[PDB]
Design an enzyme around this catalytic site. Structure first.
Site, PDB file in Angstrom:
ATOM      1  N   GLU A 102      -2.726   5.620   3.283  1.00  0.00           N
ATOM      2  CA  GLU A 102      -3.429   5.024   2.137  1.00  0.00           C
ATOM      3  C   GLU A 102      -2.997   3.577   1.882  1.00  0.00           C
ATOM      4  OE1 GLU A 102      -3.681   6.926  -2.098  1.00  0.00           O
ATOM      5  OE2 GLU A 102      -2.284   5.233  -2.197  1.00  0.00           O
ATOM      6  N   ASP A 143      -9.367  10.056   3.438  1.00  0.00           N
ATOM      7  CA  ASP A 143      -9.766   8.920   2.614  1.00  0.00           C
ATOM      8  C   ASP A 143      -9.260   7.635   3.252  1.00  0.00           C
ATOM      9  OD1 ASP A 143      -7.067   9.723   1.794  1.00  0.00           O
ATOM     10  OD2 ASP A 143      -7.306   8.505  -0.016  1.00  0.00           O
TER      11      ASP A 143
END
Ligand SMILES: [Cl-]
Ligand code: NI
Length: 345
Positions: free
Chosen positions: A31, A92
């Site tokens: 991330e 993600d």
């Protein structure tokens, strides 16, 4: 040129890795890498982009991002050495890395970045998507651990910015990416009964169900739903539908001056104060709909709080980079999901 980015590099990046020191293992996540790649592109910072990419590939992806998705968690192991702490992927972040590569490839005319972003995107399809009844093909939150039964999956609304999904389909059309856009839109629109998105939610064959672990909580994951949606171009038909549900959030800002640390998505009632990161995350949304909040003064308050997250607050820092960066016209998303940084025009 982008002061907040210059600060972030100084205080959060060490030789190509983004460090979150709130974990005593002094961790890097896929991330953190993914967001820093995006911000480096927005800043027109080719040098830092290259450093981040190289670190990501070497330490998270076994030296070859064309061969595997990056591990999501890296840092100090119990014996004192540094290495992968969890070899699972985080979808993600995989998507943000692929997107940043594709967009850097286009914006900087870098054919390597274009190819790498493409090959990574293709691997996301291969390794962390699945087709389920009713919903169709979905992006799973990771390559393992999120298939809970036959046609039963655990999903995360914040993991699927519709602009990123749009971009996957616009130069090299793909029936799979088109399906993932559609299931993601359905996920977003159908799990916010009061206009609040949960961190996690399940699809069980024929309907969405409260996540058995996270329950009805919307918190640090979910705050990004408002962030991505507020930055959608109005060309996306889902923007109006999503924003049309968010009047309760606007009233929360009017009354409480910020979103809570956790909110119950079924009742709209929240616990504790959320902080400057969450406040920046809702700034694009706040600027896009009617309320009694003076937006200019709201942004001034966020600015005043920035010294307090100069270091030691990785997550608030990336949320403020996204939200303030957008508000200050440093980047905007286009109808095809691409991004135009301020430096282009
Ligand atoms: Cl552009
Ligand atoms: Ni070309």
């Amino acid at each position: 040129e982008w002061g907040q980015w210059e600060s972030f590099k100084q205080h959060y990046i060490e030789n190509g890795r983004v460090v979150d020191n709130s974990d005593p293992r002094l961790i890097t996540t896929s991330e953190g890498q993914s967001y820093a790649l995006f911000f480096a592109l927005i800043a027109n910072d080719k040098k830092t982009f290259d450093e981040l990419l190289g670190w990501t590939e070497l330490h998270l992806a076994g030296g070859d991002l064309t061969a595997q998705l990056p591990a999501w968690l890296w840092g100090t192991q119990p014996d004192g050495s540094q290495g992968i702490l969890d070899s699972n992927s985080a979808a993600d972040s995989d998507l943000w890395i692929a997107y940043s590569l594709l967009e850097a490839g286009r914006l900087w005319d870098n054919h390597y970045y274009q190819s790498l972003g493409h090959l990574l995107a293709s691997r996301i399809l291969r390794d962390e998507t699945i087709k389920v009844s009713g919903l169709g093909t979905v992006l799973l939150p990771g390559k393992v651990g999120f298939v809970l039964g036959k046609n039963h999956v655990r999903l995360n609304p914040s993991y699927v910015p519709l602009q990123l999904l749009t971009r996957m389909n616009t130069v090299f059309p793909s029936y799979q990416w088109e399906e993932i856009y559609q299931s993601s839109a359905k996920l977003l629109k159908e799990t916010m009964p009061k206009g609040y998105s949960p961190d996690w939610v399940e699809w069980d064959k024929t309907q969405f169900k409260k996540d058995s672990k996270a329950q009805s909580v919307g918190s640090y994951n979910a705050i990004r739903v408002y962030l991505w949606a507020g930055m959608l171009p109005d060309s996306d038909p889902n923007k109006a539908l999503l924003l049309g549900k968010m009047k309760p959030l606007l009233r929360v800002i009017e009354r409480n001056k910020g979103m809570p640390e956790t909110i119950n998505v079924l009742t709209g009632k929240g616990k504790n104060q959320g902080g400057v990161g969450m406040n920046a995350a809702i700034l694009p949304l706040l600027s896009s709909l009617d309320s009694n909040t003076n937006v200019a003064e709201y942004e001034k308050k966020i600015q005043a709080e920035l010294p307090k997250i100069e270091s030691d607050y990785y997550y608030n820092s990336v949320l403020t980079l996204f939200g303030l960066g957008w508000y200050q016209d440093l980047y905007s998303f286009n109808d095809d999901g691409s991004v135009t940084p301020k430096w282009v025009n």
